[PDB]
Amino acid sequence: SMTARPLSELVERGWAAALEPVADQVAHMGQFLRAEIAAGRRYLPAGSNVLRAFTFPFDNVRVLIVGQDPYPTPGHAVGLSFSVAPDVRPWPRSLANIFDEYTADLGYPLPSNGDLTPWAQRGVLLLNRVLTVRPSNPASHRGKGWEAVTECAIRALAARAAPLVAILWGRDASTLKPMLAAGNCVAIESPHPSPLSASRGFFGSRPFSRANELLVGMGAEPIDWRLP
Ligand SMILES: O=c1[nH]cc([N+](=O)[O-])c(=O)[nH]1
Ligand SMILES: [Cl-]
Ligand SMILES: [Cl-]
C-alpha cells in the first residue's frame, strides 16, 4: 500500500532514491485513492500495480514512453503504460494503433498479444503522466496530485549520467518537455495513438527506429523492440 509503506519497500532501489522528493506526495496519493473508495468510486489499475513502472531498474532505463493515464476499462491497465495482460483481447484501440505503427516502422509482424513486459525488461520505462483513473472515465484523475510524482521521475531520469530518449505521446505527456532539457536527453513528441488523435501525426511517426538512432548517436545500445 502506497499510504502504508515507504518507497524503499514499494519501488526498486534507484527509483526509491529518485522519488525521494515526492515521498510525501506518493503517500498523499494513497490517501486520495482511499478517499475515492470511501466516497464510492473505484480506480485502475489495481493498487499493487499503480507504481509498477518503478519496479524495473532506474539505472537501466534507456527509453522513456509517456502516455496520458491508464486504460479506463476494468481488466486492461496493469501499471505499465499501454500494456495489457497476455490473455486480453480484443486489444484496446490505442494499443492496436501502437502496434500498427510498430509494424510499419520496424517491419516486424504484428505481436502475438498485448503484453509489453519485454520492453520494460529491456530498459523501456512505460509511464503515464497520471498513474490512476476512475473506471470508464479517461482523464478523471488529472490534476489530483500524480503530476508532481511523474515530473519528479522525469527530472531524476534526465539528471542521470545515463543517456535517455523520451517519447511523449499526447498533450499531457508533452508537459514533461521542459524538464527534459538536459544534454544527455532528447525528446520525441507526437500526437497520442488514441483514435482521437492518431491521424494528426502518430501514424508515420516512426518512434521506435528514431529512438534507436538517437541512442546509437549518444553511444548507447539500441532497444530490441521485437515482441513475440
Ligand atoms: O497506459 C495507457 N493506456 C491508455 C492510454 N490512453 O488510452 O490514453 C494512455 O495514455 N496510457
Ligand atoms: Cl467507479
Ligand atoms: Cl460518485
Q: Concatenate the DSSP letters of all residues of 155-209 into one string.
A: HHHHHSSS-EEEEEESHHHHTTGGGG-STTEEEEEE--SSTTTGGGTTTT--HHH
In the PDB record, what is the listed experimental method?
A: X-ray
Ligand 1 atom closest to the CA of 93, numbered from 1: 7
Backbone phi, psi, residue 101, to 5°: -65, -40
Helix (H), strand (E) at residue 17: helix 13-18
Residues contacting ligand 1 via CB (< 6 Å): 67-71, 81-82, 94, 128, 194
Q: Which of 115, 119, 194 to mutate to test the pocket of ligand 1 (most atoms within 8 A of CB)?
A: 194
**In this structure, which long-range contacts are made by residues 214-218, counting pairs with CB atoms below 8 Å and at least 24 apart in sequence?**
214/165, 214/186, 214/188, 215/62, 215/63, 215/163, 215/165, 218/163, 218/184, 218/186
Q: CATH code for 1-228?
A: 3.40.470.10
Are the CB atoms for 26 and 9 separated by under 8 Å? no
* Displacement of CA 139 from its chain's centroid (Å): 15
- Does residue 81 contact residue 193 with C-beta atoms inside 8 Å? no
Resolution in angstroms comes to 1.2
Written as nine digits, the cell of 36 is 475515492
134 exposure class (CB count in 10 Å sphere: 0-12, 13-18, 19+): middle
Query: Is 59 known to be catalytic?
Result: no
Q: What is the DSSP letter of 57?
A: -
Counting every residue written for the chain, the total comes to 228
How far apart, in whole angstroms, are the C-alpha atoms of residue 127 and residue 65?
Answer: 6
Residue 28 backbone zone (phi > 0: left; psi -120 to 50: alpha; other: beta): alpha
Give 40 Cα–ligand 2 centroid separation in angstroms: 7
